[PDB]
C-alpha cells in the first residue's frame with residue numbers, strides 16, 4: 001500500500017465526499033457529497049472537472065455504467081431516493097426509483113437495474129423504466145438491516161435478504177439461514193460462491209466452504225479479476241464504517257493485511273486494471289460540527 005495521491009473537495013472549508021467510484025474514463029474518479037452533488041475529479045492532480053446537484057440529501061451510493069453512458073445515485077431522505085442519469089456529452093435524468101433506497105446495474109449485459117426497498121427487490125428495464133419483477137416472500141425473509149439485492153455475474157440469479165432467486169422463473173431456489181443482523185451478502189465474481197458475512201456457501205451444494213471470522217460486518221469489494229477482496233467493518237454525518245479495512249486472498253480466503261488508517265472510512269473502490277484502491281477517510285470525528293473527508297489513492301499496485 002504505497003500512497004500515490006490525496007485530495008479534498010474544492011472550495012469547501014469542510015470537505016464532504018461520502019462515496020466514490022472510478023469512471024469509465026481512465027484517470028477520473030466520481031464522488032458523491034453530503035450536499036447530494038456528484039463530482040468528477042482527476043484522481044492524480046486532484047482537480048474538479050465537473051459537478052451536478054443530483055439530490056437535496058447526502059449521496060449514500062453511486063455506480064457508473066461500464067460504457068460511461070449512464071450512472072445510478074442513491075440519497076438519504078430526498079424523494080426520489082434513487083435515480084438513473086445519462087452522461088453522453090450532457091448530464092441529465094433518465095428515470096427515478098421513488099421508494100428504492102439502494103440500486104445496482106445488471107453485470108453481464110447492463111440493460112436492467114436492481115433496486116432494494118427494505119426486504120423487497122425490484123428489477124427495472126433501463127430503456128422503458130418499467131418494473132419487470134418484484135422479488136419478495138414474507139415467509140423466507142431474514143430482515144437484514146443492511147440488505148442490498150444484487151445480480152450474479154451472468155444476471156440469471158439474484159441474492160436478496162439471504163434468498164437466492166432464479167430471475168427467469170422468478171422463484172426462490174434456496175434460503176440461507178440468518179447468522180447476523182445486518183449483512184445480506186454478495187456473489188463471488190467466479191459465480192460459484194456466495195459470501196454472506198463470515199460464511200462462504202457453495203452454489204452447487206449449499207455446503208459451508210469457509211468460516212472467515214475477520215469478515216464479520218464487512219462491506220466486501222473485489223478487484224476486477226476477483227483474486228483480491230477488500231472489507232470495511234461497520235461501526236456498532238456518522239460514517240457506516242470504522243478506521244480499519246482488511247484485504248483477503250479471494251480464492252483460498254487467507255488474510256493478507258489489516259491496514260488501520262486511524263480515520264473512519266466512508267467508502268473504498270478499485271479501478272478496472274487492478275492497480276489502485278481509492279478510499280474516502282474522515283479527518284473529523286462523529287462529534288465534529290462538520291465532516292472533513294479526503295480521498296486517498298493507494299497503488300497495490
Ligand SMILES: Clc1ccc(C2(c3cc4ccccc4c4nccn34)CC2)cc1
Nearest residue numbers: 018019060061146148218219240266267
Ligand atoms: Cl453494509 C453497507 C451497505 C451499503 C451501505 C450504503 C452506504 C451508506 C452511507 C451513508 C452515509 C455515508 C456514506 C455511506 C456509504 N458509502 C458507501 C456505502 N454507503 C449504501 C447505503 C452501507 C453499508
Ligand SMILES: Clc1ccc(C2(c3cc4ccccc4c4nccn34)CC2)cc1
Nearest residue numbers: 038039040049050051052087089090091
Ligand atoms: Cl457530475 C458530471 C457533470 C457533467 C458531466 C459530463 C462530462 C463528462 C466528461 C467526461 C470526460 C471528461 C470531461 C467531462 C466533462 N467535463 C464537464 C462535462 N463533462 C457532461 C457529461 C459528467 C459528470
